[PDB]
Structures are given as structure tokens and as C-alpha cells.
């Protein structure tokens, strides 16, 4: 089944491409700035549907994280024109490129908060971090800075979907290993850090691992599984029995076809 | 005078969210569309359109 959540974000494919285009066109890139914009869209009962976006200019200092420049007024006037075009376009959130977070992320957030308590922050990188979905969404309010593993899926309107198409187990398994490796890197990292007296001293991180191990996996290993297994083969044995029968049934329908083809050919003179 | 003429119809039933049954008087029975600017709350079962 697909993953769903309390709040949910749907981000349109149109939106994503727009960021790709913004990064190359503004031509400011090659200074390695944050490419930031405001996201617009359609929201209802508890669904963010990101219907629209627009880029915002920004210039930040390249030797100070306290000194950055952004204009509010630009947001009102442009918003005003959008309201005039389509009134089904509310302020949902904003976007930042990532792939790392800033202190300053907190600073763009305070502003969007005012306009609506819920401001989604989407971390979008074209440059492929992940070979599944390379876009991840968080929703943040400060305590400190929170995050949320809110689903991201690509819904669409009728027009949007056709355009996409104009332009144009095994998958599971590659991803599965991937995930293992990401955690693996983190442990090696943790060991290093602890060795060299670096901030990690988080209780949570040890706590999650311990429980996880107790359970064990069952697509490998037998160690914890063996008692469960005894039941398991018996159920599988039955599914297979069913499968057998149906293969004969299929085979039979193929015989009917052949006999008919044979008859037809034979009487004709024979020609395929 | 530039503005478009208005044909009278009744909805028989709602097929899809994009398809409706109307029995119009430019021609006969038709399956027709509906604007995406219009409310769902206005879809009501058996109305004049």
C-alpha cells in the first residue's frame, strides 16, 4: 500500500521542474548560494497540494551567516497579482536546496510562520542524493528546530500528467541495501566521533538500535525466526498447490487454440 | 452581442466528475463537461442547468 499521513504533502511535477529551471537561469549559480523560493498552492482539510511556486531573489553573505538580505515587499505584491489571476492559490511554504541545513533556515521560517502556522520546508536536490525520490519535505516550527517525515508523493492535474508523458522486487532490493549502508556509515561515524570527543551523546540513537536487533530480519537469518518458521512453510505449501492446478487450466485453453489453427491451416492448403 | 447563447438543460445523472448526462435543445441527448471553476456543492441530484 502507499504511505499516507496526518498532514501530507503532494508536490506537483510542474513545481519541481521550475526549480530546475530557476537554478540555471538566474545565473547567479557558481557562487554556490541557497536557491530559495516560496511555494504556493492548494490546501484543504489536511492536505498540502503544492499547486504553484515562485522564485524569490536573495543575496546572502559569503563570509557571514548573520548577514543576509531578503525583501518582504516583493512577496506581497507578487502574491497580490497571483490572487488576481487565480484565487485558489494560498501560501503553503517554501523551498531550500539543501543538501545540508543552515542556522539561517530558522530565519526564513519565522517569516513564513506568520502568514500561516504550517510552513512546509522542502529540500529538493536535482543532483541525485537518492535513487528513489530525491525530494524530501519537512514541516518545522521552533522549540529546537523540528522536522517531520511527512510523505511526499506526486499527484497531478490532468494536463500536467500528459505533459510529463510527452517529454519521455528487484528495484525494492537495491533500495533496501542502500538504506542499510546509510545507517552503517552513521555507526562508523559515531565511533569516530566518540573517540574524538564530538557532540554526540544522544540517548535516542543507542536506544533505537537495541530493540531492532532483538527482533531480527527474516528474509536472511533463522536465529529468532526458527520457531515461527515451522508454521510458515505449511502455509506456502498450500499456495503452491493452488498454483499447480491453474497452470493446467491455462495449458488447456492453449490446446483449444492450436487445434483450431491446425484445422484452419490444414484445410486451406497450409500457409501460416 | 459578442456574448455566447445559453441552452437550457436538466441533468439526468452524474456519471464522472468530468461527465454528466444532459438532454439539450441545440441537439439531442449528450454527455457533457462542466467548468473547473464551479463548485462541487452545486452538484446536487437532479437539477436544472
Amino acid at each position: 500500500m502507499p504511505e499516507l499521513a496526518v498532514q501530507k504533502v503532494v508536490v506537483h511535477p510542474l513545481v519541481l521542474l521550475s526549480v530546475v529551471d530557476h537554478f540555471n537561469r538566474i545565473g547567479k549559480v557558481g557562487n554556490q548560494k541557497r536557491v530559495v523560493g516560496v511555494l504556493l498552492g492548494s490546501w484543504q482539510k489536511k492536505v498540502l497540494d503544492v499547486s504553484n511556486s515562485f522564485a524569490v531573489p536573495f543575496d546572502e553573505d559569503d563570509k557571514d551567516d548573520s548577514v543576509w538580505f531578503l525583501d518582504h515587499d516583493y512577496l506581497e505584491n507578487m502574491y497580490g497579482m497571483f490572487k488576481k489571476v487565480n484565487a485558489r492559490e494560498r501560501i503553503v511554504g517554501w523551498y531550500h536546496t539543501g543538501p545540508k541545513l543552515h542556522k539561517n533556515d530558522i530565519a526564513i521560517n519565522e517569516l513564513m510562520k506568520r502568514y500561516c502556522p504550517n510552513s512546509v520546508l522542502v529540500i529538493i536536490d536535482v543532483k541525485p542524493k537518492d535513487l528513489g525520490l530525491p525530494t524530501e519535505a519537512y514541516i518545522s516550527v521552533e522549540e529546537s528546530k523540528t522536522f517531520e517525515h511527512v510523505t511526499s508523493e506526486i499527484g497531478a492535474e490532468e494536463a500536467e500528467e500528459v505533459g510529463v508523458e510527452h517529454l519521455l522486487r528487484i528495484t525494492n532490493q537495491v533500495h533496501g541495501l542502500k538504506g542499510l549502508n546509510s545507517k552503517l556509515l552513521d555507526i562508523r561515524s559515531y565511533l569516530e566521533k566518540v573517540a574524538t570527543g564530538k557532540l554526540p551523546i544522544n540517548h535516542q540513537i543507542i536506544y533505537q538500535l537495541q530493540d531492532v536487533f532483538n527482533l531480527l530480519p527474516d528474509v536472511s537469518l533463522q536465529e529468532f525466526v526458527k520457531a515461527f518458521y515451522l508454521k510458515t512453510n505449511d502455509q506456502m505449501v498450500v499456495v503452491y498447490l493452488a498454483s499447480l492446478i491453474r497452470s493446467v487450466v491455462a495449458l488447456h485453453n492453449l490446446i483449444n487454440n492450436k487445434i483450431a489453427n491446425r484445422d484452419a491451416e490444414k484445410k486451406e492448403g497450409q500457409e501460416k | 452581442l459578442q456574448s455566447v447563447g445559453q441552452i437550457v438543460g436538466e441533468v439526468l445523472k452524474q456519471l464522472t466528475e468530468e461527465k454528466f448526462i444532459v438532454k439539450a435543445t441545440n441537439g439531442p441527448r449528450y454527455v457533457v463537461g462542466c467548468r473547473r471553476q464551479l463548485d462541487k456543492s452545486k452538484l446536487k441530484p437532479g437539477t436544472r442547468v
Binding site: 528487484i170 528495484t171 532490493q173 541495501l177 552503517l184 540517548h203 537495541q210 530480519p217 536465529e223 529468532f224 | -
Partner: protein, 94 residues
């Protein structure tokens, strides 16, 4: 020091350590279990308590070291399964 291989432990060992009698531990686990300090079930067929863990255990450091090697073994096992799949055809559900 490995995964769990059981969590059944009998009253006799605990009662000795606790220095309360065999009768007392039954009543006690029942008091403990009400609170949900104990997550577990009580088996009265061998007079053993099957425990279910939930303990914090704050600051592990040594276990962590071991944890890094065990996880590593796990990455390899899935990898093997993957190789075989790659070799033969293409998974198409249709």
C-alpha cells in the same frame, strides 16, 4: 551480548538474587507488571516469566562497538540475495 535467544527466565534465580522467597516473587512480578515496569507474561507450567524488554540502558559504549560489526554482517547478507536477482531477467509484476 548477541540477539535475544529467549527471554524466559525462572523465579529461582531471581528470588535468590532479590533475597525474597519463591512465593514473594510471584506477587512481586504481578505488582511490577501492573505498573508496566515489567512487560511480559507469566507462565504457570514451569513457573517462569517470559519477559519482554523495554529497558533504557543509558550509555552503552562497549555494546556500540560490537553493534558496528554486527550491522556490517547484515549489509552483506542482503547483497548476496541481490546478486542472484540481477542475473536472472527483469521483475515486472505484469
Amino acid at each position: 551480548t548477541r540477539p535475544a535467544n529467549h527471554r524466559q527466565l525462572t523465579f529461582e534465580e531471581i528470588a535468590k538474587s532479590a533475597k525474597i522467597t519463591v512465593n514473594e516473587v510471584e506477587l512481586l512480578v504481578m505488582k511490577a507488571l501492573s505498573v508496566g515496569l515489567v512487560k511480559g507474561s507469566i507462565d504457570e507450567v514451569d513457573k517462569r516469566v517470559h519477559m519482554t524488554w523495554v529497558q533504557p540502558r543509558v550509555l552503552d559504549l562497549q555494546q556500540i562497538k560490537g553493534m558496528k560489526d554486527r550491522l556490517e554482517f547484515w549489509c552483506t547478507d542482503v547483497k548476496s540475495m541481490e546478486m542472484l536477482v540481477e542475473h536472472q531477467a527483469h521483475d515486472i509484476l505484469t
